[PDB]
Write a protein that binds this ligand. Structure first.
Ligand SMILES: O=c1[nH]cnc2cc[nH]c12
Ligand SMILES: O=c1[nH]cnc2cc[nH]c12
Ligand SMILES: O=c1[nH]cnc2cc[nH]c12
Ligand SMILES: OC[C@H]1NC[C@H](O)[C@@H]1O
Lengths: 262, 263, 266
């Protein structure tokens, strides 16, 4: 039962942070990890591996951390380092952070990710709010039949608050694929025809579990490269890494400023 | 252990318990269709699915539905009131087992029904729609190994013709089968329109494939319980979806009975 | 972490292959598509033939029966590994088994993989019996044979250079985008219209994972489809494996002769 496990995690977080409950959670994906320090200095820093349900028993190594950071008047749970579906782990582990945070009282989830840009106006290094998504993984983190509507899965209200911080923020449709491989140029032309503006390898399941758990969602992509076949040249791993490293401080500041308005 | 073997074993229990050697037609009632049972016709036999070989997975449980034996016209029909979807996490063998068991019990025609969101402009809530073809978007198949089944005319034009003889105004449409259990985003719905879908659901495709692989004809019927996500400008309503299925239950059952009678 | 380890198994299979064939390393590997079996002879006289069942990592423990063979064939100045028989994802086994032949071949020295298949034709000009080079693909399986975070760019996954060489062999060769679906069932007419909208010219039940694994392992790939039928709904006639096998046998000698002449130019 994912619910009872998130419940236990929430209890551990409360006792380890001294904070009765948190209000917001932020998931830092690829291209957003170096922006952690910019969100604010943490009051508590604890390894995900020491928290119930975060890391699967078999496969291991060293998970990220879970930070408790005060931002504005909020107590924010910051997840630095997520476990991906491409490793083969059940999706309950992928969405556990969201479920635990909700159990911890978090009602807003800020989900970030690295993404390839498909719409012509999007540039490398540009953060883009997610207006909607295309779940192209043929999976779901939900088991059983509860009713879960995904209309406005990415709260228009929260996107409006984000624009108070930066009125020029672009908005677009994110396509979530299984990965880990990047797409062929043919696949990118396909995604374009399907209405995708951004392409990535995460986030969709977290959004679904979030909405199912009663939380609002703000998604933010960092365009780390133009999608395959667009430039006429192969992708550059170096560029993808630099996109995240360079905008680190700027991205951390933006998120803190936005979250403060929540 | 074997899928076909379990189907045969199930057919045997069905035969003995219903007192009917073979059933000519099988009906799988989808979400929202349950209350149509009475209008379909009173059963002569009712047996718990949990008491039939192969119907329930080992681990996850609780209590499955019922299997009905109903005389309709000059036919003996197996009516499955309660199914298990792929989104429930079980191997597809359990999802299509009712179809294979029905075939083993003699069913040559499978009538597969379901609840679906409507994408084509002319479709209205409460409208039954004949499935003309499907888009299997689950990235899966209930077939394992080299079972290369042709899916041209998967939904018998013959049976669709008979259905129209019952109601000449019945519309047809392409059904998009997704994994579920979450409903779609407006963007996903726009994507489905581009791909040629008229209806969107969370079942049926695997049942259709298994039916065809087993050599049975298929009539597909969707009940539009809501307009697809992003079309009304308002969020989907669980209350309204459920209200829609109950509201058209009697009408759906009566429709099914008249069409089947023509087989 | 996962046991067995893909790369360890590939290297061990390479060693077995080297000892059994008496050849230290091979230069090219050919994976034969379904229906293409009778084309093996056309490729050339084998110096070594061995059961795939006698090679580590090729056959899953549970499900069995009898796998194909692996042949060592000299083609031009090349020592070529020919895989007559393979396993597809629809058989239900981990993709590790689907791409192991490619990984084993690379570990054996092959830096060029020639992946062949039977496909339904969707683009109007492609005809039954026509060999088509694969220019790109659409992986519609929602899976990947990769489980690590390594950066893998699929741009030019099907080497433009190799397609250039294939055309020096046959300047008439057409090219097309191949859509790989899970199978084993064939497509409905509606799904075929959908694939056409997505940009697919050919449709099949293999190849995509092999290509991805090959690119990840550092090998170039030349993809070759044999149109064995027009995709569902085009002719209004139902498809059949028999039909596919028929086209495969009918073009066997021509396909093998073509592969041989193209590989000779590598
Ligand atoms: O181009 C891309 N495709 C898929 N995922 C990512 C993540 C960053 N860039 C990309
Ligand atoms: O809108 C819908 N989407 C997917 N499945 C169903 C089943 C009933 N309505 C819907
Ligand atoms: O039409 C087809 N669809 C899928 N696979 C194949 C393989 C040969 N022909 C086809
Ligand atoms: O006839 C169908 C088979 N041939 C090619 C497909 O991949 C499948 O294995």
């Amino acid at each position: 039962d994912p619910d009872e496990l998130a419940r236990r995690a929430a209890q551990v977080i409360a006792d380890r942070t001294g904070i009765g409950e948190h209000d917001v959670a932020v998931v830092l994906g690829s291209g957003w990890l170096p922006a952690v320090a910019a969100l604010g200095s943490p009051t508590t820093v604890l390894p995900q591996a020491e928290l119930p349900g975060f890391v699967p028993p078999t496969a291991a190594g060293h998970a990220g951390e879970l930070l408790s950071v005060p931002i504005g008047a909020h107590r924010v749970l910051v997840l630095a380092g997520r476990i991906h579906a491409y490793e083969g782990h059940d999706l309950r582990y992928v969405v556990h952070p969201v479920r635990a945070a909700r159990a911890a009282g978090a009602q807003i989830m800020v989900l970030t990710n690295a993404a390839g840009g498909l719409r012509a106006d999007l540039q490398v290094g540009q953060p883009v709010l997610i207006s909607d998504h295309l779940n192209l993984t043929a999976r779901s983190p939900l088991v059983g039949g509860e009713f879960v509507d995904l209309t406005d899965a990415y709260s228009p209200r929260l996107r409006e608050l984000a624009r108070q911080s930066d009125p020029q923020l672009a908005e677009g449709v994110y396509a979530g694929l299984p990965g880990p491989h990047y797409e062929t140029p043919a696949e990118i032309r396909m995604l374009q025809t399907l209405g995708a503006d951004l392409v990535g390898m995460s986030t969709v399941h977290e959004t679904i579990a979030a909405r199912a758990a009663g939380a609002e969602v703000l998604g933010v992509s960092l365009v780390t490269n133009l999608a395959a076949g667009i430039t006429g040249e192969p992708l550059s791993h170096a560029e993808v890494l630099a996109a995240g490293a360079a905008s680190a401080t700027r991205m951390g500041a933006l998120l803190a400023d936005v979250i403060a308005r929540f």
